[PDB]
Amino acid sequence: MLSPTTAVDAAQQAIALADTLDVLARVKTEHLGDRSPLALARQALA
RNA sequence: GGCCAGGUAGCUCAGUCGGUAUGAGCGUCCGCCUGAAAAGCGGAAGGUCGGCGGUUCGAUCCCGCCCCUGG
Ligand SMILES: [Mg+2]
């Protein structure tokens, strides 16, 4: 599950839908950070 | 300045010579619970790993200089 990506599309779309600074902090948690599916792929680079 | 062990989450500190810090205890948030709490149980948030550069698709971890504590 590495080939394209759709994770960037869902991240930038949720970023574009953040209305307040509180939503963007959650969007940064869901689509970035440790538990995000984007970084879960970087973990699978082992 | 010399030589050195360090600087890692809000506090006090472990841990790692390339893709996860599974970080711990406590602090913060949610649920069950309570009139409202706390504990308990369950579920989460949060670190640019000292700064600035160097190498690599990728550096807290390797190279150089430097900031401050034990020296
Ligand atoms: Mg509670």
UniProtKB/Swiss-Prot annotation:
It is found in: Cytoplasm. Tetramer of two alpha and two beta subunits. Belongs to the class-II aminoacyl-tRNA synthetase family. Phe-tRNA synthetase alpha subunit type 1 subfamily. This is Phenylalanine--tRNA ligase alpha subunit. The gene is pheS. The chain holds residues 1 to 49 of 341 of the full protein.
